[PDB]
Design an enzyme around this catalytic site. Structure first.
Site, PDB file in Angstrom:
ATOM      1  N   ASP A 181      72.059  74.803  49.855  1.00  0.00           N
ATOM      2  CA  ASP A 181      73.425  75.378  49.827  1.00  0.00           C
ATOM      3  C   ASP A 181      74.113  75.352  51.207  1.00  0.00           C
ATOM      4  O   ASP A 181      73.665  76.030  52.138  1.00  0.00           O
ATOM      5  CB  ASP A 181      73.291  76.829  49.328  1.00  0.00           C
ATOM      6  CG  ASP A 181      74.619  77.459  48.897  1.00  0.00           C
ATOM      7  OD1 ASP A 181      75.676  77.076  49.422  1.00  0.00           O
ATOM      8  OD2 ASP A 181      74.552  78.402  48.075  1.00  0.00           O
ATOM      9  N   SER A 184      78.100  83.616  43.834  1.00  0.00           N
ATOM     10  CA  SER A 184      78.862  83.450  45.062  1.00  0.00           C
ATOM     11  C   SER A 184      79.521  84.784  45.482  1.00  0.00           C
ATOM     12  O   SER A 184      78.799  85.769  45.736  1.00  0.00           O
ATOM     13  CB  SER A 184      79.852  82.289  44.869  1.00  0.00           C
ATOM     14  OG  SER A 184      80.250  81.846  46.132  1.00  0.00           O
ATOM     15  N   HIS A 235      75.307  74.692  46.419  1.00  0.00           N
ATOM     16  CA  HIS A 235      75.762  76.051  46.097  1.00  0.00           C
ATOM     17  C   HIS A 235      75.635  76.393  44.611  1.00  0.00           C
ATOM     18  O   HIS A 235      75.227  77.520  44.253  1.00  0.00           O
ATOM     19  CB  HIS A 235      77.204  76.264  46.566  1.00  0.00           C
ATOM     20  CG  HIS A 235      77.663  77.691  46.501  1.00  0.00           C
ATOM     21  ND1 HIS A 235      76.891  78.752  46.939  1.00  0.00           N
ATOM     22  CD2 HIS A 235      78.838  78.227  46.073  1.00  0.00           C
ATOM     23  CE1 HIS A 235      77.565  79.881  46.761  1.00  0.00           C
ATOM     24  NE2 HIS A 235      78.755  79.588  46.267  1.00  0.00           N
TER      25      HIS A 235
HETATM   26  B1  AIO Z   1      81.890  81.285  46.454  1.00  0.00           B
HETATM   27  O1  AIO Z   1      82.662  82.395  45.723  1.00  0.00           O
HETATM   28  O2  AIO Z   1      81.780  79.971  45.679  1.00  0.00           O
HETATM   29  C1  AIO Z   1      81.982  81.220  48.065  1.00  0.00           C
HETATM   30  C2  AIO Z   1      81.653  82.554  48.758  1.00  0.00           C
HETATM   31  C3  AIO Z   1      82.998  83.269  48.866  1.00  0.00           C
HETATM   32  C4  AIO Z   1      84.048  82.183  48.920  1.00  0.00           C
HETATM   33  N1  AIO Z   1      83.386  80.977  48.390  1.00  0.00           N
HETATM   34  C5  AIO Z   1      83.883  79.764  48.207  1.00  0.00           C
HETATM   35  O3  AIO Z   1      83.186  78.851  47.762  1.00  0.00           O
HETATM   36  C6  AIO Z   1      85.335  79.479  48.525  1.00  0.00           C
HETATM   37  N2  AIO Z   1      85.433  78.291  49.375  1.00  0.00           N
HETATM   38  C7  AIO Z   1      85.107  78.342  50.663  1.00  0.00           C
HETATM   39  O4  AIO Z   1      84.612  79.334  51.174  1.00  0.00           O
HETATM   40  C8  AIO Z   1      85.311  77.080  51.484  1.00  0.00           C
HETATM   41  C9  AIO Z   1      84.060  76.218  51.292  1.00  0.00           C
HETATM   42  N3  AIO Z   1      85.453  77.397  52.896  1.00  0.00           N
HETATM   43  C10 AIO Z   1      86.122  79.177  47.234  1.00  0.00           C
HETATM   44  C11 AIO Z   1      85.991  80.261  46.165  1.00  0.00           C
HETATM   45  C12 AIO Z   1      87.615  78.937  47.483  1.00  0.00           C
HETATM   46  C13 AIO Z   1      88.345  80.127  48.069  1.00  0.00           C
END
Ligand code: AIO
Ligand code: AIO
EC number: 3.4.14.12
Lengths: 651, 651
Positions: B597, B522, B629
């Site tokens: 995803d 991510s 995801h």
């Molecule tokens: B990941 O790190 O799982 C993804 C890309 C950057 C941020 N992100 C997230 O899943 C965040 N949530 C959201 O973006 C929500 C679905 N809008 C998480 C890490 C919480 C901040």
């Protein structure tokens, strides 16, 4: 010899700057430019009429008279252009509809194109190829020979459940439905319209039921009164050649019907004899070999013209009198192509290009002479021009690399000879042991081993890997029996024959039997994957591009010919369904797919990876998001490097 | 200790068969079964009211009285269930619309659910989470505290350009639009409805313009007359806490506004003091650290209750009198979590869980006692139950593997301490040199290094690879300054700090500096890819899962907080756009994506492969067509094996 072809009674080629004519005259790009060496499309070889693609429309040009013919405005459409035999109009498809544009003579102004259709859309396709380009279908427009009428396909695909084709380049990805009719599902409904230019009226052929019937090889009568159609049933074991009235669309008569134990497959139109509205040549593989048959328009067979345990591979035409046929065939050898003459009464062929190897030949408009282009393992290129039954004249002759070996092995039946080619490692040393990759295709309509002069084999060979290919049963130009053994049983015989290739490789002392790999694309991607799953102890590493993995998800018009329908053949489909045997992957296999592939949909490789997840097996992957079935152009360098490095890493 | 929790004044847990109560009584699955140890959801801890999920509907159950409450029929909907605080009705969303089902008492028959909405569809979403689950939003239904009203979100996303999400499992693949609003594009329009149960009338809050405003942290007044909303502007640098009349939807007043140089981010609702309709606690990071603030409903700040260079990480509640606050915080150390008491007048905190490490604590309904679950590097699990200001009682205590080392390094500023964890090779030998993989996340809201007791690091370590993680600046629970340095510049500081981690690794004699790899998911997938492209001489091999690659294609509500909008910040977005630097990939990088995803759309990794094709660079790939995801469940074994083997093959 760029653009070597006939124009009237002259043979012609380009010299970067000149167009050179011989029977010597020369026509330069500046000579030409003054009248408005560039690219052109030849429309009428007999008259040397061509079309030039220019900024701001198409320019028709008479190369024999050295004069512009017509300017055409097709609103920038080029893919679908089909010029009338009269030369003064062009049909094309734009924003879903069929149009005819009339040519405008220099300084006489232009007229607006005619809309033949107005209700074209995503599920209703006009003037394009139908039936997934099976049965020789390459386009959807068919001018009558005097230009009086334009026949065209209308394909209603509103009953076909579509597959998403996704364009990843916009900010948010955009999907478009592809109406790809999969094996065993409802097919699309094709009808044939005929637009009459004099009246502006359209009539549809009364082809009737079942609406799924395949309407193929449309062929106009010379007098424009009848449109002939070769109609093929859903089972693909019956072909009826039918005559329809062009004026009313009414059914007139069935000329003849062909049937087969396995399948019939009409691939060529009716070709009328010179000056005749009553006799034509029909190509048929009915006797086990593709041959030329002479019919009259009542459907009465006059005679089989060619016969023998060999196949006609190109019908080139007639002498002006229509007393002789000219054609390419495998008569000399299935590994070779020669050009022949035969009396229309039949009997003995005469080989006009006797040298052993691959001849590609062009008969002159007047049927008096031929351009021949020849290549063989020893001859890179020999270009000849011959007055038939007179003197021949050579126009051009060409003269560490991997060694290429060729030979024969027995197929798995122990009786049928198979021909192979083997590209040896660069700087091969007989004292050394080498890895080897079987490059496989193995599907119908292809023949990879011929007596000839895209080079992935040479690249692999340069990296120290031998590359072996064998044309297993199922492959082309060896007659119907040799091909049809695969019927209802895709992969089974093909793999058995490929394992005879492996047996041969293992009999070579210089082969490292523990380092055998496999690569192929499309049907070859199916074969690569199937060989790894079926013969996992042998094939250590493979790469399978655009692979068919589940034949239930291949198109009706191809899949059901060779496999029958899924409901009719669950045992055969199940045996070839690689999703069911993903747990048998114990080597290294990379699958590669173009994301926007409209031939083998991306779903095939994605589902295989999904099956491997559940099965706990471990393939590798690459996706070309901008490519369709094959990776074309400069990106093909990236493809070769990805494939090559997979083998150099793992095999 | 399965299901350890409060029910009334009893602490409770499961023993496979029994539910055990202590303040000792025991309630078995057969005792329970006779009244219709299974799974349940606790609805009201104070009253020990739960719901049991059974074949044929939901059964409410009073665990203190040992009696069935109500049977509920929600037509098999479970995801969206939100029970009224009264306990006799449940809201849920089915086929696009919001319903309320009334509980039926044993043998008194059932009533049909009420349809709150009737025009729900793909572009008009009711009763669900909105704003991409930012701002603490986890659901879309909000009962008034006496059950008189149900507030709910209405999200019109008809102006959002969707992304295809493709289900590959049907014969022909099926796509569904996902209305994922990307950075800089038009946002969706959320309004808040309130359904009044007594009258069946709905009123919408008059939240006004701009229609894109973010409506967050809905919080009912105790007397049900006012619905409070924390409204955040598109820039995300202003938060207004507003009161609306629940009867009419009319705007009443703005209580207070928070602003920030970089961003404001409300994450928690208003929490009213016990027995008060006039005073509440509001969480705010306004002073640089998340703290508890005491307000009255006119908007007047009474006092900041907690303060210090540490953060409240969970607000657990009050003493019955509302004279004390209970909460979890980082006061002891950002690597630790302890549970504290503080006077509502403020001043000195009292640590109720003093032992060094990670405490997870549950305050009893009556506020008199706590269940504590503790773990530390030396203590796997210690479960305590304490009467606050009285005796404590231990309920449970737990007692070759890779060695885990921890310490501190300086960030790239040379001033800020960063905390790291290092999982050593199994059977580590100080005389030997080892490869090492930096496991990176690095994004906001996460903190990977705490003083604690999914194990991919241990697996890698067992294969002879050290795994190093450091919480670089941008990461959580270290105050706003430590996080906000990343604002408008995603990847820049994070990578600078990760390179300090590399500097530290290279200072270890046992590290093979030529065999350093990197992995993350991510934001960690973005970081992995960015580190390989930016520091290609260091990072030889990486694996990047669900990676963000182009921040212009991430969701508005997260991306614009940390990065601002693409139009406001082209320099920052361009610097982080990994598509622009694909030609810098000179090592081995596998990207992995779940095809469906809906968080980081598949397009990110596909476009990177496409960029690499044009750039002539050579990543590897894997796609999980059935996963969103993250890869969840048994398939995670396949994921770990794919990732691990990539490193053991190439690093
Ligand atoms: B990941 O790190 O799982 C993804 C890309 C950057 C941020 N992100 C997230 O899943 C965040 N949530 C959201 O973006 C929500 C679905 N809008 C998480 C890490 C919480 C901040
Ligand atoms: B491939 O081998 O390129 C693909 C899968 C098996 C058959 N195939 C084809 O592309 C064939 N054409 C069609 O299927 C048309 C598009 N219906 C080719 C090889 C001609 C037979």
């Amino acid at each position: 010899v760029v653009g070597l072809q006939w124009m009237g009674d002259n043979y012609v080629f380009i010299e970067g700057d000149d167009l050179v004519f011989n029977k010597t005259t020369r026509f330069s790009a500046a000579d030409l430019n003054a009248l408005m060496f560039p690219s052109f499309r030849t429309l009428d070889a007999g008259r040397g009429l061509v079309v030039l693609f220019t900024q701001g429309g198409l320019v028709g040009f008479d190369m024999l008279a050295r004069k512009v013919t017509y300017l055409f405005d097709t609103n920038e459409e080029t893919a679908s252009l089909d010029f009338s035999p009269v030369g003064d109009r062009v049909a094309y498809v734009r924003n879903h509809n069929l149009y005819i544009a009339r040519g405008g003579k220099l300084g006489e102004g232009m007229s607006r194109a005619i809309a033949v259709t107005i209700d074209g859309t995503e599920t209703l396709v006009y003037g394009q190829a139908v039936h997934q380009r099976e049965f020789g279908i390459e386009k959807g427009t068919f001018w009558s020979p005097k230009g009086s009428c334009l026949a065209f396909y209308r394909m209603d695909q509103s009953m076909v459940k579509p597959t998403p084709i996704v364009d990843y380049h916009p900010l948010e990805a955009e999907s478009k439905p592809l109406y790809y009719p999969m094996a065993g599902t409802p097919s699309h409904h094709v009808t044939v319209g005929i637009y009459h230019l004099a009246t502006g009226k359209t009539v549809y052929l009364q082809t009737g039921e079942p609406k799924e019937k395949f309407l193929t090889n449309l062929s106009w009568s010379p007098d424009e009164n009848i449109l002939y159609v070769a109609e093929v049933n859903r089972a693909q074991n019956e072909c009826k050649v039918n005559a329809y009235d062009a004026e009313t669309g009414r059914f007139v008569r069935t000329l003849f019907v062909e049937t087969d134990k396995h399948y019939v497959e009409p691939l060529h139109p009716l070709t009328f004899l010179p000056g005749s509205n009553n006799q034509f040549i029909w190509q048929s593989r009915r006797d086990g070999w593709n041959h030329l048959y002479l019919y009259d328009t009542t459907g009465r067979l006059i005679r089989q013209v060619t016969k023998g345990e060999w196949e006609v591979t190109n019908f080139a035409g007639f002498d002006p009198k229509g007393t002789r046929l000219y054609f390419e065939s495998t008569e000399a050898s299935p590994l070779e192509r020669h050009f022949y003459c035969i009396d229309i009464k039949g009997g003995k062929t005469k080989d006009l290009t006797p040298e052993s190897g691959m001849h590609r030949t062009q008969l002159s408009p007047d049927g008096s002479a031929i351009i021949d282009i020849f290549q063989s393992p020893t001859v890179p290129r020999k270009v000849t021009v011959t007055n038939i039954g007179k003197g021949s004249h050579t126009l051009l002759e060409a003269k560490a690399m991997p060694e290429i070996r060729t030979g024969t092995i027995m197929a798995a039946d122990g009786q049928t000879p198979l021909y192979y080619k083997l590209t040896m490692p660069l700087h091969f040393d007989p004292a050394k042991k080498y890895p080897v990759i079987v490059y496989v295709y193995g599907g119908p309509h292809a023949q990879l081993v011929t007596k000839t002069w895209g080079g992935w084999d040479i690249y692999m060979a340069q990296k120290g890997y031998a590359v072996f290919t064998v044309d297993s049963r199922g492959s082309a130009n060896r007659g119907a029996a040799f091909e049809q053994v695969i019927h209802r049983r895709l992969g089974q015989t093909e793999m058995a024959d490929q394992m005879c290739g492996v047996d041969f490789l293992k009999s070579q002392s210089w082969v490292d039997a523990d380092r055998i790999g496999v690569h192929g694309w499309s049907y070859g991607g199916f074969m690569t994957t199937n060989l790894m799953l079926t013969h996992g102890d042998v094939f250590k590493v493979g790469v399978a591009g655009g692979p068919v993995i589940d034949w239930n998800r291949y198109a009706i018009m191809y899949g059901e010919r060779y496999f029958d329908a899924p409901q009719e053949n669950p045992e055969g489909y199940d045996a070839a369904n690689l999703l069911k045997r993903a747990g048998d992957l114990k080597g290294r296999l990379m699958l590669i797919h173009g994301a926007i592939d409209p031939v083998v949909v991306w779903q095939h490789s994605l589902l295989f990876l999904d099956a491997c997840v559940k099965a706990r097996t471990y393939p590798d992957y690459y996706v070309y998001p901008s490519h369709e079935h094959n990776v074309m152009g400069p990106d093909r360098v990236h493809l070769y490097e990805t494939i090559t490095r997979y083998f150099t890493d793992h095999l």
